[PDB]
Amino acid sequence: GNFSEIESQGNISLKFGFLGLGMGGCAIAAECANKETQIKNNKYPYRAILVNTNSQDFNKIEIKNTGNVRKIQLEGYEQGAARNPQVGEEAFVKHETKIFEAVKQEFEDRDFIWITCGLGGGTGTGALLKAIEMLYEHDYNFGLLLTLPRDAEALKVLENATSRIRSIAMNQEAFGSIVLIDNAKLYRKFEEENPSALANEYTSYSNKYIADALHEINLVTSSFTPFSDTHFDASEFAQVINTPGVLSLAKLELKSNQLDTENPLGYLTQLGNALEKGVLYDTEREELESAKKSALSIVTSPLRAGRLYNFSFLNQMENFLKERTPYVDERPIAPYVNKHTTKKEEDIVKFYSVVAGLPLPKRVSDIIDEITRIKEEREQAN
């Protein structure tokens, strides 16, 4: 995930802060906060506060971005493998004053905060609702960056996740977007693109993959030259990220010759598949249909832009999004020119979309059925 070229000539739309809770949430938050960029006068664009109980692992969470990443240790509530949310909850409440003082100072210059948490654990999951109340009570603009557990994590972790996800959705109107991450999906993605990969490379891969997906859309929305008057800029991006409900990201890269405007079915089908098989989780038409907001940006070279962004293409794209998110407040189709595209990448056309205000995905229901299976077979066994 090297965005050096783009960063040296671009910028990020929003100054994100990450409030990590628990091991996984802190690992993801740290991965994002430690990102180094080639952005003018902004080597380290992100900040983070990592809240977790003491442990060797938590001590192990590196930290490159100095000063912009602070660890807050939940003294006295180390939980071990108890996987008990009630304890995580008590921990957060007990240390709330210390935590908020840290949040207050570190996030003063932030535009938006991501409460980052791996659903299923004790500390993170347990502290989640309290953390949300804290940011809400102090009027921060914030959203949730959450992972859903793999089936192998078993019963307790799945119930822990199911419990919070349910409560989150019920109270979703109280805050911004919920960027869901399906660990099962990403685990599979890893195996497939790295068949000969070993288990020791997954965690790093998934955390970098997540951080890169968020940073990339943050970059794309403020680093290129708009071809027209329709934009998906920092302002619009903020509008979308602040929309309640689940948020889905998609990205498709095609070679210029695979994008036929006289025979659009081919590339429109690929775009449709990219939107459903999203970056962080998998969605479907039924879910997309109820989107509250959506935006799609297209980026290509000076060489290709002029010939691509014609009436036919733009109209086909307008139609495409209209069929996918029919009831959206606004769905801009925003073509961009990357004026500094290399000769080597001259033919590439990139598509980026963000869909917001979505319902919980199918993976949440599959987890419920996995929990249901286990409990019912346990009864039959009895």
Ligand X SMILES: Nc1nc2c(ncn2[C@@H]2O[C@H](COP(=O)(O)OP(=O)(O)O)[C@@H](O)[C@H]2O)c(=O)[nH]1
Query: At its nearest, how many Å lie between ligand X and the CB of residue 55?
Result: 8
124 is an annotated ligand-binding site residue? yes
* Sequence-separated (6 or more) residues with CB below 8 Å from residue 371: 155, 158, 159, 162
| 147: nearest Cα among 126, 114, 120 | 120
Query: At its nearest, how many Å lie between ligand X and the CB of residue 160?
Result: 8
| 29: nearest Cα among 54, 57, 1, 62 | 62
273 is an annotated ligand-binding site residue? no
62 is an annotated ligand-binding site residue? no
Pattern 165-194, binding to ligand X, x per CB under 6 A?
A: ------------------x-----------
Dist. CA 320–CA 261, nearest whole Å: 13
Q: Which is nearer to ligand X, 23 or 113 (CB)?
A: 23
Q: Does 283 bind ligand X (CB under 6 A)?
A: no
Q: Does 157 bind ligand X (CB under 6 A)?
A: yes
| The one among 153, 159, 216, 236 contacting ligand X by CB under 6 A | 153
**Residue in the structure block whose two tokens are 């003294």:** 75
Query: At its nearest, how many Å lie between ligand X and the CB of residue 92?
Result: 11
**Using CB under 6 A, which of the segments 6-14, 116-124, 308-316, 350-358 binds ligand X?**
116-124
118 is an annotated ligand-binding site residue? no
Phi, psi (5° rounding) for residue 329? Answer: -60, -45
* Sequence-separated (6 or more) residues with CB below 8 Å from residue 69: 30, 33, 34, 47, 48, 50, 63
Q: Which is nearer to ligand X, 177 or 301 (CB)?
A: 177
Structure tokens, 77: 């509530």
Q: Which is nearer to ligand X, 23 or 219 (CB)?
A: 23
Q: Does 203 bind ligand X (CB under 6 A)?
A: yes
DSSP assignment of 314-382: HHHHHHHHHHHSTT-S---EEEEE-TT--GGGTTEEEEEEEEEEEPP-HHHHHHHHHHHHHHHHHHHH-
Asked whether the CA dihedral 26, 28, 29, 30 is positive or negative, the reply is positive
Q: Which is nearer to ligand X, 121 or 278 (CB)?
A: 121
Q: Does 162 bind ligand X (CB under 6 A)?
A: no
How far, in whole angstroms, is CA 135 from its chain's centroid?
19
Q: Does 207 bind ligand X (CB under 6 A)?
A: yes
Q: Does 59 bind ligand X (CB under 6 A)?
A: no
Helix, strand, coil share (%) of the chain residues, nearest 5: 50, 20, 30
The count of chain residues that interact with ligand X, using the rule CB under 6 A, is: 21
Dist. CA 299–CA 252, nearest whole Å: 11
Query: At its nearest, how many Å lie between ligand X and the CB of residue 146?
Result: 9
Dist. CA 345–CA 175, nearest whole Å: 39
Q: Which helix (H) or strand (E) holds 163?
A: helix 154-170
Q: Which is nearer to ligand X, 10 or 22 (CB)?
A: 22
Q: Which is nearer to ligand X, 120 or 176 (CB)?
A: 120
| The one among 162, 206, 218, 223 contacting ligand X by CB under 6 A | 206
Residues 12-51 that bind ligand X (CB under 6 A): 22-25, 27-28
Q: Which is nearer to ligand X, 13 or 147 (CB)?
A: 147
Output DSSP code: residue 257.
G
Dist. CA 182–CA 276, nearest whole Å: 13
Dist. CA 65–CA 34, nearest whole Å: 5
Q: Does 361 bind ligand X (CB under 6 A)?
A: no
319 is an annotated ligand-binding site residue? no
Structure tokens, 352: 């980026």
24 is an annotated ligand-binding site residue? yes
Q: Does 123 bind ligand X (CB under 6 A)?
A: yes
Query: At its nearest, how many Å lie between ligand X and the CB of residue 317?
Result: 32
323 is an annotated ligand-binding site residue? no
Query: At its nearest, how many Å lie between ligand X and the CB of residue 30?
Result: 9
Query: At its nearest, how many Å lie between ligand X and the CB of residue 374?
Result: 16
Q: Which residues are annotated as a binding site for GTP?
A: 23-24, 122-124, 153, 183, 206-207
Binding site for ligand X (CB under 6 A): 22-25, 27-28, 118, 120-125, 147, 149, 153, 157, 183, 203, 206-207
